Amino acid sequence: VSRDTWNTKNMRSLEPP
Amino acid sequence: MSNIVGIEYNRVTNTTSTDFPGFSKDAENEWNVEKFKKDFEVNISSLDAREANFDLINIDTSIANAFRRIMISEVPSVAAEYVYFFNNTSVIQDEVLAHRIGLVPLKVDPDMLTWVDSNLPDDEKFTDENTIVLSLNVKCTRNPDAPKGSTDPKELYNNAHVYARDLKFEPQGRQSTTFADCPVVPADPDILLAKLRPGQEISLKAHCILGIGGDHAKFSPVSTASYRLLPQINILQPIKGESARRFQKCFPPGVIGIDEGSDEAYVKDARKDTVSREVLRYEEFADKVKLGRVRNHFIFNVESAGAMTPEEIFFKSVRILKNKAEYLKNCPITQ
Amino acid sequence: EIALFKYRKARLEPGTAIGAIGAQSIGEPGTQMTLKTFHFAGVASMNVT
Amino acid sequence: PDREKIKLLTQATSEDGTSASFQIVEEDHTLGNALRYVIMKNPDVEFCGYSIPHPSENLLNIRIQTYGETTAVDALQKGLKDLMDLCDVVESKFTEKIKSM
Amino acid sequence: EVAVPDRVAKVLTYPEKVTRYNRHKLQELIVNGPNVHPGANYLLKRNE
Amino acid sequence: GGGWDNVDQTKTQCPNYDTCGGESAYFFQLQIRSADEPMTTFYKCVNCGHRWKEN
Amino acid sequence: VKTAETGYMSRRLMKSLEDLSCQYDNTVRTSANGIVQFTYGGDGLDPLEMEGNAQPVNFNRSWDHAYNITFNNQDKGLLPYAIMETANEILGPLEERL
Amino acid sequence: AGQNATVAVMSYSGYDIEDALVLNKSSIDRGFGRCETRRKTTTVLKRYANHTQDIIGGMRVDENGDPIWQHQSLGPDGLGEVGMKVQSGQIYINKSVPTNSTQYREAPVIYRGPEPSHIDQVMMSVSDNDQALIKVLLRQNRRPELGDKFSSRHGQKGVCGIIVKQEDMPFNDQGIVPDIIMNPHGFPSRMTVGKMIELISGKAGVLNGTLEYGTCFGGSKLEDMSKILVDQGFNYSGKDMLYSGITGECLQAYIFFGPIYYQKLKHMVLDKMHARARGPRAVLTRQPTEGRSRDGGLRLGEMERDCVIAYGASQLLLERLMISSDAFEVDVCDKCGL
Amino acid sequence: XXXXXXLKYICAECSSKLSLSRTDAVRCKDCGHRILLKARTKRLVQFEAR
Amino acid sequence: MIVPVRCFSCGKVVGDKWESYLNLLQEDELDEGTALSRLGLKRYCCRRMILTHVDLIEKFLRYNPLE
Amino acid sequence: HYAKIRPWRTFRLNECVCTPYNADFDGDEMNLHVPQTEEARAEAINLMGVKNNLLTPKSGEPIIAATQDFITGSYLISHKDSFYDRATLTQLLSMMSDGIEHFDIPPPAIMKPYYLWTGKQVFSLLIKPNHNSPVVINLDAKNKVFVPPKSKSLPNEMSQNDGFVIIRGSQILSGVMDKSVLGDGKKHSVFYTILRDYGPQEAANAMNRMAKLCARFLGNRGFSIGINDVTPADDLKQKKEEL
Lengths: 17, 335, 49, 101, 48, 55, 98, 338, 50, 67, 243
Ligand SMILES: [Mg+2]
Ligand SMILES: [Mg+2]
Ligand SMILES: [Zn+2]
Ligand SMILES: [Zn+2]
Ligand SMILES: [Zn+2]
Ligand SMILES: [Zn+2]
Hints:
part of a larger assembly, 11 chains, D: about 100 residues, alpha+beta, four-stranded antiparallel β-sheet, 2 helices, F: about 55 residues, mainly beta, 3 strands, DNA-directed RNA polymerase III subunit RPC1 (chain E), transcription (chain J)
């Protein structure tokens, strides 16, 4: 916990289909 | 009033914002950052692999509810969408079994998959960037042992219980490399998918794709994302003696304490308080206690279904709200 | 002006199926009334239907 | 260039702006309420409110009426940008708290 | 108003005669056909 | 005569309150509606003798 | 019992009163052109259009509506007789028409 | 026969007026109110006095080897394959009847369903009179949809007026979201106090881990259930402070919130939706047929005719009672009216 | 890369695997049971996981 | 029939708790309420999911036709 | 009716028009006929149209009007304890319309310490949303629960409860929005007066406005019934026992 994953992982799933 | 939601015996009062210019002659509380920036606070009470408890202090109800709604129904997650039954001779129907598999949450990281394009023919729609393939091959046989007659069906039959852990990840194409360090498993391996008897067999594979909780619940990534306004208990006049013990028994065990010496009751932890307003039915604390809720203090409790960490779920919800605002701002307005 | 306009508008229009309208206006109430005569408890009057 | 996302409703629009209805597709109470709150925090806005005309349609009509200072379109743009800035503030605070713990 | 299911609207029809005022609309409905709702199930030619 | 004192009044204002100031009504309740529907109540104003069913 | 008796009185009275319609000379006649009422209700008024208590006009509501619609604090109120002069100027053409 | 729905008794969305119920989408997604119907079709291959009998041979293919669409799920034996889906128009029993009951005329059993079914059982047997007997079981999963009927053990029935997303539902401090919302207006006139007591007793029972009793003239006392509710942090009367799911703010009234046993009734709108434009007619009267199975029309009876007359709509009378029911172009002699 | 897709009878009581030859009987061969059920189809059946 | 995977109201996974609940009731017997609380079923919706489940699949499996 | 094509399998209708049909959404099935000729279609929509038949022909009283939840929501909005800030008021008006109607916001009833509008102002805006609307309504009505004023000589709007409705120029000056002023059978009804003074279209516009407003308002406000609503008080136990 207490570790950022949004910074290091590019959010592909958040793109509009 | 004045930012405090009123908890009365028969009604709730002061439930709206009242923090805009035009509420009063003092046209204050007009929007600006560097006021919201200095006012707003985040207090993370606890963080786990699946549950997060954090406070959003000095934020509006509409924004907090937007985050909650996006977490529930707009953060994408991976769930089985199509189940292909090669063989199912169990007592559970194929549609029921497919629904159960879809409800099984998969410990596969989103943003490692691409949204399926619906405008493609079924033979070119599913790619290795779009889909996870899960196989399931279970057959029941009589156990070649001699235990006590008619015992439980665990040492009596082989593979009598089908669990979510029996769903096998089948990498396709480049998934053999990208998923090598993180093989796809169900977040809850011990989900009882099916029970079946000797001679019965389930053989299937399931295609798991990104999806939205608003579309189907199986895609929702939170077993519950919710908040609650921070309770506020105001002891207007001192309560002492046996009356203090009676007053203390009207709240959850650790909510308000009894001072030693001064002997007066005092509010020890209002965060532990569920607002049952049990004090408001006794007529001896009617003028001695005021129950409230801080309207702009939100105690968020985010519990993940298993696919992503709750902090990531919340951050994605904030990102989604920002991105829809940004996309709408960039869109040209059509006549 | 308002009163005269309302009185003029209140006149029955030619072509109206006034007989059918009256039949339904008298019979539709006849569906919500009991066949049996139900009286207030304590009237003790002659049992006129 | 999305020409179908947001539409000015010309029938529900005043002369020289200051009053307009915008139809936004594929949006619901989530964006509607937050946008309405942010817009209502604009001193020039005298009327903000949204409605989902029917549950069977992924659609949202948001109404803005201002005074003479700005137009409804400008009020909507300012509200959207302020919503983004709010989301940035929340993201920064949450990220710093997550890192610290 | 009454809300009508699209399924029963695809079978319940109105016999709209083609005039100079609605020919384009009825052409679009014929192109749509009987399987998408803003469409048509039957055509009766003038001379048939 | 009449034994209306031996009937169950109630606290209701009849529709003809613009003619008489009646706040009472002898009543009886019958379920002339279906089992899925609730019960129907009948009234009779004591100030004018005007009857009406409030359903 | 009510369900069983629904559609009986209405049907019977319908068979009786099917063909009674208002004529263009304000008479209610059978389909055989025989007069049942020389005027409907002895009034000629549609029960659907009666704002009052079986009367066409609600005088009090109409008066209040006229007062509010024509209200003007910068207007001169008539004398009691001038009100009646206006009333008898409007009514009396119609009264002596009959 | 039922399920313990989480119920919030409150006015909501305006789609719950008049017994109508508000059902939670994503409770339906998770299997709430999910049912299925199984239907059997029975055909006998009867022998005849000419030593002939019906047969179930068939399953003709196209040149590419694949069966024709009518025979997509039919199997080599001519009887539909277990597990295969049958859409409307497909054959699952390909019965051929002799033409001199040598030559066989097709009399196959064709699936006529608005929604597809799945063949889940095909039974081949004989009766006591030495005659072939084929029974096919068709199953069909059913999602609770708009218009499906529910009831709650207290005569409070109603159809689903609206299906709403979970995030649109009101929620409590723990995030509990009702599966069903029922109108408070159904209570005051029906006086089903037993339903409120059931809600409180069920809430106390779920929080206490014990199934409660609502036995006639007895059951679990209301005060003990209130004691359980208070001891677990809930209001004694089962009214919780909820937040609006669409605004997020506290609801100004406390909402009756708890579990109620809800039964899904056999009246689903999928079996009631009927619509006829034109089709089968009874030859005797040349009027549309009488049943939803035969695609019959709706009867405009004497009462509806009287209503239309009372409206004064002569042309509508003509259109409904002649033009759209039975319009015959007869030849009449002017001399003798024959 | 992409990704593509993915006459036995049963005795009602003894659960034996029957294969009915052309016009033989409708009876089980091991026991005399007269009720036979078709085995599940061997081909693929696809379902929505909803 | 068989325990639902998820709570109808919450969406919390309860299909992995049926067997542990049964073993909590049988081995080292607990009350039903404390057995539910020991499994993390805190909310009353998730509680009723397990408390009211009728395991009909075991009865159905007694009529297994593929013995 | 005018057809509106929708995705589900039911005949949906506005609950305001359930009373003439006597329908109660509990498995009720209704028959829909499509007239096939132009003359029959015009006759249907001009003689049997819902807007042309808001009054029963047996008495002339309105029969298409507010049903239960619409009445309760109207009463709760117009309740004398209802005060709304500008944001809540504008959201209420947007829900009342479809977010496509211009509203002239009147001065608030309370100007110090806060700009607060009453629910009666909300319903005044329901009747007459802006100056371009011609619906100017004047009305005196008694609510079904009307306790008289404290004194015999005192006028009717001085009732101890909000039992007398005064509307002057489409402005609700007193009295709650009730069944007797928004429901059936009353010729002092708001919708009856709008009909008789300005047309079926105006009356239907007001009714649709109210229906949308209530459908969106009751759920967000919260209205519930519980066992505590039917639990007698402790003193009633002793009083009833001895009586
Ligand atoms: Mg009923
Ligand atoms: Mg009914
Ligand atoms: Zn009276
Ligand atoms: Zn002749
Ligand atoms: Zn056998
Ligand atoms: Zn739950």
